[PDB]
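Record [L-Ala51;Gly51']HIV-1 protease, 203 aa.
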Amino acid sequence: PQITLWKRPLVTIRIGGQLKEALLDTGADDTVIEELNLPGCWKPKLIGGIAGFIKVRQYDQIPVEIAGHKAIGTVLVGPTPVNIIGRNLLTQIGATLNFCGGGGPQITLWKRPLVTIRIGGQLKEALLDTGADDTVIEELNLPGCWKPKLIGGIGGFIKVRQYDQIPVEIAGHKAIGTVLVGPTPVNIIGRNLLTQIGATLNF
Ligand SMILES: CCCC[C@@H](CN[C@@H](CCCC)C(=O)N[C@@H](CCC(N)=O)C(=O)N[C@@H](CCCNC(N)=[NH2+])C(N)=O)NC(=O)[C@@H](NC(=O)[C@@H](NC(C)=O)[C@@H](C)O)[C@@H](C)CC
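=>
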């Protein structure tokens, strides 16, 4: 399918025989699913996100059907806020990110989808994250007014400053919208700006 990003990219998956809903997440290295039992052997791991680390169980070589497309790979199980399909399995199903519905750059997901952005006069690197509602930038002295906000994900919540109507050029494509500023470990471009540049998921 071709999937636009006006709403969260939620799909049905089948894993262990069970149907579950999960988010297609270009900003996730790995696939992480809420607590459940998987047939077999696992090992403990820690993984990180916007707001810290959590402990998970790693299962290897697990068959997963994602909207009808077959994958077999690593699934992490633990207290994730949302079930997420990460790049380890998105690559198996042939998923790419495409600008302007395919006329613009194609970005494969073998490595993190990092691109150059321009914001407040400054050039920065940022991750294109289909699993982020909002755009979150590293502490930057933007002039202007703001409101407090808290945003969540793996590890909990962080406090940020919400600025509106901020221009953000992404790989040469102009966007303008809300930007959240705070201590994120990676600059994140979320769906609020990805939609403005005609970014789609395709497989
Ligand atoms: C789970 C919640 C939905 C997915 C998540 C994906 N964001 C990326 C951001 C990249 C990091 C800042 C992510 O967490 N990636 C993880 C996913 C876990 C994974 N293992 O793949 C990752 O790739 N982690 C690497 C990063 C390295 C960690 N550090 C280290 N190894 N030293 C890893 N392998 O652990 N989205 C988010 O966290 C966003 N949350 C949301 O969009 C919504 N919040 C919630 C709770 O649903 C909305 C209501 O705010 C944040 C940014 C706010 C806008």
